[PDB]
Structure formats: C-alpha cells, structure tokens
C-alpha cells in the first residue's frame, strides 16, 4: 500500500470528483513580509501561522505552518520567474502563499543574495511548494487535490496578470504548455539532474496528470 498506489487505483474516480467541484476560494493574507523582509527572517519570524527562517545550511528562506496532525510522498512544485523579478513575484504571490486557505503548509524561496546569478535556483525554480497527502492514511482526497490544483492555477494567474516574465525551468521538472511558471517533479522517483527519460517518467505520474488533465 502507498500514496501513489491509491492514486493509480482511484485515478478516474478522483479526476471525475475534482472536475465537478466548485471553484476554490482563497482568502489572501495581508500581514506578510515583502521579499526584503523575508530575507530578514533569520532564526525566527512568523507570518500568518507560517514559521520563517533564513539561517539554515542552505540558500533558501523556509516557510512552515504546522501540518494537520499523511507522510510526504515526493510531490512538489517549482515556480520559475525571471531572476530579476523574484522580489516582485514573491510579493504578488505572498497573499496566496501565506493564505489561511492554502493547501501548502511547507514552502521555500531562494535567497537571491546567497546564490550566484546563473545558479539553477536563481535562473528558475526560485520557489518550491511541498505537497503532502491530506488524509491520515497518507492518501490524497479529491477535495485536497482539487484545492491544490486550483491553488497553483491561482499562482499562475497572479504572475501572468502582474506581467511577470517567465524564468528557466529546471531540467529536472515537467510542465504543460499552459503552465508558464509552475513545474513539477516527484522527489521519490526522480532526481535533480533530469533528462528526457526522467521527464518522460514524470509526465506519467498520476499526481501530475491529475494536476494537468
């Protein structure tokens, strides 16, 4: 038994349930840092229940809201924007990323001052959104999958409406033509390198197909 096994065996049921659901509404947060403030999180900051830190042994500012008390199943999104526009992109998305209605409890953004300009996580993939199965038995529910898909589509729309220029999608990730910023990989069944073979495998991931079709 596994998260992905449940997705395979309920593939059409989940998809059909999702397409019948009304549009998700996300109350956007206002009492949030801008990108500069985000970089100043240090040891501890908090905005809208998301604990913030920028003091780890890595180049990211991490955001974590307490999860409902399934286990991480590898499913995650990157957001790629033009390197120069990360601060504006972050601000535009902050209402959604810190929303009390967001299905994403754990995410991270590159600290652009900690990386060389031409770095993988500088030219693109400046955000990572980590998805966890919402049910106690580590299964995804249709309600949550719908919410998650609606959420990333809201992120797409906000960036597009703000005229944010797209970034350089990492070689590791896949995305459909209608995702100009968002991309996907599964951490359990793919690597950071990528390649056509890996990208081909990722396109078959039930989770990815449920997000796109």
């Amino acid at each position: 038994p596994s998260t992905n096994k449940h997705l395979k065996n309920n593939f059409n049921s989940l998809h059909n349930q999702m397409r019948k659901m009304p549009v998700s509404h996300f109350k956007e947060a206002l009492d949030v840092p801008d990108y500069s403030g985000m970089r100043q999180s240090g040891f501890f900051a908090m905005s809208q229940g998301f604990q913030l830190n920028n003091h780890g042994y890595d180049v990211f500012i991490h955001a974590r809201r307490e999860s409902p008390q399934g286990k991480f199943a590898g499913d995650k999104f990157h957001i790629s924007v033009l390197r120069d526009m990360v601060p504006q992109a972050f601000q535009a998305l902050s209402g959604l990323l810190f929303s009390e209605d967001s299905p994403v409890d754990k995410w991270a953004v590159t600290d652009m001052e900690k990386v060389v300009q031409q770095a993988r996580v500088s030219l693109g993939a400046q955000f990572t959104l980590y998805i966890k199965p919402d049910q106690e038995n580590s299964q995804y529910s249709a309600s949550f999958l719908h919410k998650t898909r609606q959420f990333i589509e809201c992120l797409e729309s906000r960036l597009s409406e703000n005229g944010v220029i797209s970034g350089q999608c990492p070689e590791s990730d896949v995305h459909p033509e209608n995702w100009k910023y968002l991309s996907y990989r599964n951490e359990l069944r793919s690597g950071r390198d990528g390649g056509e073979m890996q990208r081909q495998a990722l396109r078959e991931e039930p989770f990815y197909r449920l997000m796109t079709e």
């Binding site: 042994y57 990386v115 993939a125």
Partner: peptide, 9 residues
C-alpha cells in the same frame, strides 16, 4: 549541500 530543494524534516 547548499542548493538542494529537497524536503527536509
């Protein structure tokens, strides 16, 4: 070491 977008617990 510093550049991984890996989920850390």
């Amino acid at each position: 070491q510093y550049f991984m977008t890996e989920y850390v617990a």
